[PDB]
Amino acid sequence: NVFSMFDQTQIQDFKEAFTVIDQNRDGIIDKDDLRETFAAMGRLNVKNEELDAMIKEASGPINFTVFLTMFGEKLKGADPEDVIMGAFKVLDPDGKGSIKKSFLEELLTTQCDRFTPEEIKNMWAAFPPDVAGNVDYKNICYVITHGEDK
Template sequence: MDQNRDGFIDKADLRDTFAALGRLNVKNEELDEMIKESPGPINFTVFLTMFGEKLKGTDPEETILNAFKIFDPEGKGVLKKDYVEEVLMTQAERFSKEEIEQMFTAFPPDMSGNLDYKSLVHIITHGEEKDQE
């Protein structure tokens, strides 16, 4: 999404993302409204929080989990940090080193280098509520 790779999602990035999804005539007002929803600059962490808030109540958790399970054939619920980093930096829309660092800062792996994707999906779909359980 961060087409200009400056670490933040701005109006131009949103327009480019819509274009990549096949929607070419997005009105400036619509983009402005999306940007206004953020409490400040939209970095990776803010984006995930906003995305999670939008998804609340739509119950896409199983769909997102199934996407992660493709990379976890043994069904352990965790992925190795190094593996996640390699896939994100070498496949499809490649992440930069800075984007990888942002992601792992927001969702750090455990001491063994495992990323608990089940917890990550819960945060994405329900917000930070898991801490209150």
């Protein structure tokens, strides 16, 4: 599933990300490579159990492919931002100003079995303010592709 969405651009973003964590340039990221990438980003308080927890997710040396497979496997239902924006633009169909909370509450719960009312309240809390104001779909897309603080 993890090689089927997954475009060349996404994969290059990942390749560059790997080479930035890959301190030694060897081709395999290890505990040492993780330690000074954390240090270069300002994080000095790193304990071995956290570094080890990271590495334990893979069965072998963390090599480009083992990385790409492990990160794909967690994003099995995740698109690139423009594609996600298209789904909202279809729900927008009139254009420019994004949708209201009620209109999508109902459409996530209704056709099919469930986007559960536990999942949806977590959505209004983790998607915001945004979801209250303009149900800011533009913002929603940028936070899922680019991190939570941004």
